[PDB]
Amino acid sequence: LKARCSRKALHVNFKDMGWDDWIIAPLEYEAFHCEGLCEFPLRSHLEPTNHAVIQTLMNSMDPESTPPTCCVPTRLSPISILFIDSANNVVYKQYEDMVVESCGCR
Amino acid sequence: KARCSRKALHVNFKDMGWDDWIIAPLEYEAFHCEGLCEFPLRSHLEPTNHAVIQTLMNSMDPESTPPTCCVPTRLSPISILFIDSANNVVYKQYEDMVVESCGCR
Amino acid sequence: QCRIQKCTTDFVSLTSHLNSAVDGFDSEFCKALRAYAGCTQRTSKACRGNLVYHSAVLGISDLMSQRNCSKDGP
Amino acid sequence: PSYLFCGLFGPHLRTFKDNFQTCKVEGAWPLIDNNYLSVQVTNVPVVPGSSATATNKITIIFKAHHGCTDQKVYQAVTDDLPAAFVDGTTSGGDSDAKSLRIVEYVEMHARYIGTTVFVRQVGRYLTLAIRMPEDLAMSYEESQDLQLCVNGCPLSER
Amino acid sequence: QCRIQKCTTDFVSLTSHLNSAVDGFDSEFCKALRAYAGCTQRTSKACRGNLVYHSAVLGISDLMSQRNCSKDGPT
Amino acid sequence: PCNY
Amino acid sequence: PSYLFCGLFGPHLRTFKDNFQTCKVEGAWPLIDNNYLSVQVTNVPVVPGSSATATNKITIIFKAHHGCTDQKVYQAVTDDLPAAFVDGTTSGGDSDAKSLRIVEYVEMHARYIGTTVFVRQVGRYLTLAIRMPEDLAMSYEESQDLQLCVNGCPLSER
Amino acid sequence: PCNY
Amino acid sequence: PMMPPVGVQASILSHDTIRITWADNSLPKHQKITDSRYYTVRWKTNIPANTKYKNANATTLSYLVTGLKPNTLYEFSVMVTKGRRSSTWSMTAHGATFELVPTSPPKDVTVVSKEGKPRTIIVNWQPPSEANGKITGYIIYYSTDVNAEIHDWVIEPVVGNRLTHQIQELTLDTPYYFKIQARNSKGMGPMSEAVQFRTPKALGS
Amino acid sequence: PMMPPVGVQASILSHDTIRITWADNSLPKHQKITDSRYYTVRWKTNIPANTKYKNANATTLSYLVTGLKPNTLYEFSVMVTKGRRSSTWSMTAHGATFELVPTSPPKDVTVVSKEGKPRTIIVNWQPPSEANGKITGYIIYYSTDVNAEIHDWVIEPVVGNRLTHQIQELTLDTPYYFKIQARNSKGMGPMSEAVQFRTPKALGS
Ligand SMILES: *[C@@H]1O[C@H](CO)[C@@H](O)[C@H](O)[C@H]1NC(C)=O
Ligand SMILES: *[C@@H]1O[C@H](CO)[C@@H](O)[C@H](O)[C@H]1NC(C)=O
Ligand SMILES: *[C@@H]1O[C@H](CO)[C@@H](O)[C@H](O)[C@H]1NC(C)=O
Known part of the structure; x- marks a missing residue:
């Protein structure tokens, strides 16, 4: 079935990726992902740009003139990563835009 | 099977009947984004860290997550001259009306 | 004030359960669209110049034409 | 091609450079004075001695453009907004020539210079909206330095 | 500094036209992949902690497994 | 032809 | 369940509340002192008279958790990072009990309290990373008010 | 069972 | 009903004068009027806004229009009446008056x-x-x-x-x-x- | 080659002593050694880091291990040698020593x-x-x-x-x-x- 634009689970396991040779912690985190239909009308929480408002309108009126807008992360949050840096030192650093906080149509 | 690109999208306010309140412009080029976001994402698609990881995971196992999506990453305004509620002629920048760049998010 | 988002929320709430593959999609949709049209008309003056409003009005009108939803109706 | 917009209303001015200004500019003043078009307005104090002024006359000169239009002059005043040029014509040049036309806001479509001019009367005064291509809007000679749409008003008028 | 973007640009430039409907898709792709793997390997230290780099390394290794590209071979 |  | 993280490295402290601090904290100091765990460190001035200090000893007490683990003590010092508790064991309780284990960074997995402790030697000193569930990290008695991971360092130590 |  | 007049033509004479001429198909050759019919000529321009048509009755198939504005485009149409019978307005013809020296200051x-x-x-x-x-x-x-x-x-x-x-x-x-x-x-x-x-x-x- | 010893068992005697015993399947009934064979016992714990195995030769099928740390888990394995013939190390057995009063201060x-x-x-x-x-x-x-x-x-x-x-x-x-x-x-x-x-x-x- 074709769900509407929603935030869905996405588990990232750095150990499974072999990245524990440089990442110390965390070795896994919840990243989420966005997925689903962007249909007219965009609900307010999909927080469209003016462009997405117009494109969604045009795709509704003529799906051949433009494709629909796309369900993508509209707010993301960082996670703090403890890792071994290029100088072989322990570094704690915020990696921005790692966790989807909200999805929307763009 | 085209890769993420900025494509033409012409908006005609007169065709939409908005020329009863919009004075100018009555048309403009909005563009749109469309196309595959495939591993590896070229630098100009400007992925977030999240998009980098998602594209990687979808490359390794398309069942684990869908690909990232081609969407506007930079937009620009257009100035619209129109009449507002109080019959005032207003000239206003409408933000985020024109796709300047597309990328994978 | 422009209250288009109230109209949209109502329309989305009312149609959120609709699945195009289920047997009564168009009849519930049209009733919903008609209410959405009425709601948007009641905030029209306050919303002039608001792209979300103008897009809603046109999108609704187009859908009601596409789906052959009568102008008046339940 | 990209478009520049100019506006005058109740006076208040919105320049091609998107600077919004409140100008007194009493009497006759050029909004546009370039190679293709002349836009001239008359502003009157709303009450005597007031610094707040409003538009009672709009003159537009569509300069002769060989093969497209002969020179046409449009003029609107308070309580007189015709749908024709001063010579009673509604189009430039021949009967077949539609590069310049007027339609009833009254609107002037100067397709030949990608220019639109909208004129209306709001209460006792006139409003104006101009859409012009950037290269044409900025195409003027050194001496044409007084153009409210390009440079806004003199500091002393604000 | 970290120069993974050059590696990626080269790989994308070299493979963008490739279409599986033509004969030598997989060989040309594997050649480009090996070159991409080599380019990324040579900037490993400078790129430590750059998710673009680490994702490239893993995605390359995974693609080479998926497309059955020998780790050693022509580029 | 006259068109900008 | 949500996780809180604590770190100590070359000293520099990152608290469960994400405040980053540079503390002298010379001698033995509690990082964690709660109902489930004791984390104790020894810090030494890098050179005599220096306010810059670094870690030469890490003691971890995994308190007895009935049915999961007997009390286990881990201790690492500069040039001695074992992969076992002080009693030579690598797991808590019985042979079948794997709720508490050590793996060679040397890591301690206290699954029973959703807690991970990573210990490594960077040069002449020791670093520490702790991942603990928020409700367990904040579960301590009134008298347990000195905990560098919870409240950071005393103002006089910064 | 011991697991948090 | 009655057939409207045809071949309406505007002959420019000066800055304020235009002669209007038309043919009646209902009439015999040389446009000889042998009954009680009369024609009505109507004219206006688009300056200033909202002007109304000016009218004039004509006993024959021509009418001289005077007091017009200089360098102005006017529209002209003709109709015929015979007691009870009346035709519709003919196809319109246009005529622009000649220039005159300006008569008012800047x-x-x-x-x-x-x-x-x-x-x-x-x-x-x-x-x-x-x-x-x-x-x-x-x-x-x-x-x-x-x-x-x-x-x-x-x-x-x-x-x-x-x-x-x-x-x-x-x-x-x-x-x-x-x-x-x-x-x-x-x-x-x-x-x-x-x-x-x-x-x-x-x-x- | 030679069959490794079996049934390695650790008998705890004190805080520093453990007796190790094992069986040899190659041996006859009553475990009587009637040839020039000798056994090697190896032991270690995991404290401190990187310790090496301690070894000891045994003339018979038992060995008393002394000087161990109190309350410590040790691993023990046995092997047999006969001039040229040598077996592999047996399956490991474990043994934890008894407690002793602390012998050092906080x-x-x-x-x-x-x-x-x-x-x-x-x-x-x-x-x-x-x-x-x-x-x-x-x-x-x-x-x-x-x-x-x-x-x-x-x-x-x-x-x-x-x-x-x-x-x-x-x-x-x-x-x-x-x-x-x-x-x-x-x-x-x-x-x-x-x-x-x-x-x-x-x-x-
Ligand atoms: C790679 O090998 C596997 C196993 O034979 C095969 O299923 C797959 O189709 C091959 N893919 C390519 C690109 O050669
Ligand atoms: C033309 O004749 C009719 C009938 O006599 C009359 O009603 C009308 O007023 C006349 N028109 C003019 C312009 O005098
Ligand atoms: C055990 O015996 C062998 C052979 O004589 C000898 O090489 C080895 O060093 C002895 N081991 C010990 C612990 O003395």
């Missing part, structure tokens, strides 16, 4: 000091309301002497498609008087009544 | 003034390196008199799973001396050498 003469250049003035104006043809130029006359005879005033000729002009090298803290006249292919229009402008002085810092 | 005794409470001190320490069993408590002794006999020092008993303690109601601008001892199921360990801490005074505002 308007709204405004004089300002150029910003940062107080020895320069900007003269701004509006066209004559009775231009009576394409304005081919304007003449600006200026003087420091309000009582000087017209031939003693400084002359500043200007293009007809512009409504702003700059005059340099003037004396500061001095009254100046300005008059403007329009010109077309037929000649000079009247002069506007003199406008006074005193140039600014210096504000010592 | 370490890194640190005394600090509590923030905002200068009449309160915080005592922080590290366990004895020779705990020799599960620490069931500590005893903190303190005095204002450095020469007072041990029985005249204030006693502050404390839990064994904590390494920080707070002492309230002390006198300001006063030298205090602190000693700590660990305890386990076997008894009291030695006391740490006295540490001096002078309490702060007031900074009048």
Whole structure:
């Protein structure tokens, strides 16, 4: 079935990726992902740009003139990563835009 | 099977009947984004860290997550001259009306 | 004030359960669209110049034409 | 091609450079004075001695453009907004020539210079909206330095 | 500094036209992949902690497994 | 032809 | 369940509340002192008279958790990072009990309290990373008010 | 069972 | 009903006169009227806004229209009546009157000091309301002497498609008087009544 | 090659002694050695890091391992040799030694003034390196008199799973001396050498 634009689970396991040779912690985190239909009308929480408002309108009126807008992360949050840096030192650093906080149509 | 690109999208306010309140412009080029976001994402698609990881995971196992999506990453305004509620002629920048760049998010 | 988002929320709430593959999609949709049209008309003056409003009005009108939803109706 | 917009209303001015200004500019003043078009307005104090002024006359000169239009002059005043040029014509040049036309806001479509001019009367005064291509809007000679749409008003008028 | 973007640009430039409907898709792709793997390997230290780099390394290794590209071979 |  | 993280490295402290601090904290100091765990460190001035200090000893007490683990003590010092508790064991309780284990960074997995402790030697000193569930990290008695991971360092130590 |  | 008149033609005679002629198909050859029928000619232009049609009855198949505006496009249509019988209005014919010398002066003469250049003035104006043809130029006359005879005033000729002009090298803290006249292919229009402008002085810092 | 020994068993005798016994399947009934074969016993624990195996040759099917650490888990395996023939190491058996009274004092005794409470001190320490069993408590002794006999020092008993303690109601601008001892199921360990801490005074505002 074709769900509407929603935030869905996405588990990232750095150990499974072999990245524990440089990442110390965390070795896994919840990243989420966005997925689903962007249909007219965009609900307010999909927080469209003016462009997405117009494109969604045009795709509704003529799906051949433009494709629909796309369900993508509209707010993301960082996670703090403890890792071994290029100088072989322990570094704690915020990696921005790692966790989807909200999805929307763009 | 085209890769993420900025494509033409012409908006005609007169065709939409908005020329009863919009004075100018009555048309403009909005563009749109469309196309595959495939591993590896070229630098100009400007992925977030999240998009980098998602594209990687979808490359390794398309069942684990869908690909990232081609969407506007930079937009620009257009100035619209129109009449507002109080019959005032207003000239206003409408933000985020024109796709300047597309990328994978 | 422009209250288009109230109209949209109502329309989305009312149609959120609709699945195009289920047997009564168009009849519930049209009733919903008609209410959405009425709601948007009641905030029209306050919303002039608001792209979300103008897009809603046109999108609704187009859908009601596409789906052959009568102008008046339940 | 990209478009520049100019506006005058109740006076208040919105320049091609998107600077919004409140100008007194009493009497006759050029909004546009370039190679293709002349836009001239008359502003009157709303009450005597007031610094707040409003538009009672709009003159537009569509300069002769060989093969497209002969020179046409449009003029609107308070309580007189015709749908024709001063010579009673509604189009430039021949009967077949539609590069310049007027339609009833009254609107002037100067397709030949990608220019639109909208004129209306709001209460006792006139409003104006101009859409012009950037290269044409900025195409003027050194001496044409007084153009409210390009440079806004003199500091002393604000 | 970290120069993974050059590696990626080269790989994308070299493979963008490739279409599986033509004969030598997989060989040309594997050649480009090996070159991409080599380019990324040579900037490993400078790129430590750059998710673009680490994702490239893993995605390359995974693609080479998926497309059955020998780790050693022509580029 | 006259068109900008 | 949500996780809180604590770190100590070359000293520099990152608290469960994400405040980053540079503390002298010379001698033995509690990082964690709660109902489930004791984390104790020894810090030494890098050179005599220096306010810059670094870690030469890490003691971890995994308190007895009935049915999961007997009390286990881990201790690492500069040039001695074992992969076992002080009693030579690598797991808590019985042979079948794997709720508490050590793996060679040397890591301690206290699954029973959703807690991970990573210990490594960077040069002449020791670093520490702790991942603990928020409700367990904040579960301590009134008298347990000195905990560098919870409240950071005393103002006089910064 | 011991697991948090 | 009755067949409307045909072949409506506008013959331009001057700046205010146009002769209208038409044919009646219901009529025998040479347009001989042998009954009590009469024609009605109607005309208007689009200047000023909302004008109404002017009408005139004609005993024969021609009518001379007088008192028209110069250089103006008019529309003309004809209808026939015979007691009870009346036709519809014919197909419209157009006719533009000839030019006349302008009969009114330039308007709204405004004089300002150029910003940062107080020895320069900007003269701004509006066209004559009775231009009576394409304005081919304007003449600006200026003087420091309000009582000087017209031939003693400084002359500043200007293009007809512009409504702003700059005059340099003037004396500061001095009254100046300005008059403007329009010109077309037929000649000079009247002069506007003199406008006074005193140039600014210096504000010592 | 040669069959490795079987049924390796660790019999705990004390805090430092474990008897190892094993069977040889290659041997005849009653495990009587009737040839020039000899056994090798190997043992180690995981404390401290990177220890190597200790080895010992045995003429018969038993070996007494001495000088072990108290309350420590050891691994033991056996192999057989006969001139040229040598077997592999048997399956490993484990054995944990008994507890002993702690034999070393608590370490890194640190005394600090509590923030905002200068009449309160915080005592922080590290366990004895020779705990020799599960620490069931500590005893903190303190005095204002450095020469007072041990029985005249204030006693502050404390839990064994904590390494920080707070002492309230002390006198300001006063030298205090602190000693700590660990305890386990076997008894009291030695006391740490006295540490001096002078309490702060007031900074009048
Ligand atoms: C790689 O090998 C596997 C196993 O034979 C096969 O299923 C797959 O189709 C091959 N893919 C390519 C690109 O050669
Ligand atoms: C034309 O004749 C009719 C009938 O006599 C009359 O009613 C009408 O007023 C006349 N028109 C003019 C312009 O005098
Ligand atoms: C055991 O015997 C062998 C052979 O004589 C000898 O090489 C080895 O060093 C002995 N091991 C010990 C622990 O003495």
